C-alpha cells in the first residue's frame, strides 16, 4: 500500500512556504511543512477573505495521533485527516497547494 505524506507537504521553511503561496495562488493556499526545531509539523495558509493574510498553525505529534493547536485543540489519527479537517473547518476555502 502507499502511505505518503499529504500532497501539500513540502520540506520547506516558513519563508519558502509563504513565497510559494504568493507566487502561485492558482495552485492552492495551504502547505504542510516540517515544524521548525521539532519533529512536529506546521501548516502555512494564505487566505483572501478580507485582505490577503499569511497564517501558521502548529500540528503536534502526540502518541500515534496529531493535535492541531487551536483555541479548542483537535486530535486526528494521521496527516491526511489533518488536511481534511482544515478544508472542512474553513468550508472549502483552504485548498492544498499542489505544486
Amino acid at each position: 500500500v502507499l502511505n505518503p505524506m499529504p500532497a501539500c507537504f513540502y520540506t520547506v521553511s516558513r519563508k519558502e512556504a509563504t513565497e510559494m503561496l504568493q507566487k502561485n495562488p492558482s495552485l492552492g493556499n495551504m502547505i504542510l511543512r516540517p515544524g521548525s526545531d521539532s519533529r512536529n509539523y506546521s501548516i502555512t495558509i494564505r487566505q483572501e477573505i478580507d485582505i490577503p493574510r499569511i497564517k501558521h498553525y502548529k500540528v503536534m505529534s502526540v502518541g500515534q495521533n496529531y493535535t492541531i493547536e487551536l483555541e479548542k485543540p483537535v486530535t486526528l489519527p494521521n496527516l491526511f485527516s489533518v488536511i481534511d479537517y482544515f478544508v472542512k473547518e474553513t468550508r472549502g476555502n483552504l485548498r492544498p497547494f499542489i505544486a
Binding site: 497564517k55 501558521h56 502548529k58 487551536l70 483555541e71 468550508r91 476555502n93
Partner: peptide, 10 residues
C-alpha cells in the same frame, strides 16, 4: 515564531 490558534471560515 508566532502561530495562529483560530481557523477562519466564511
Amino acid at each position: 515564531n508566532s502561530y495562529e490558534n483560530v481557523l477562519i471560515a466564511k
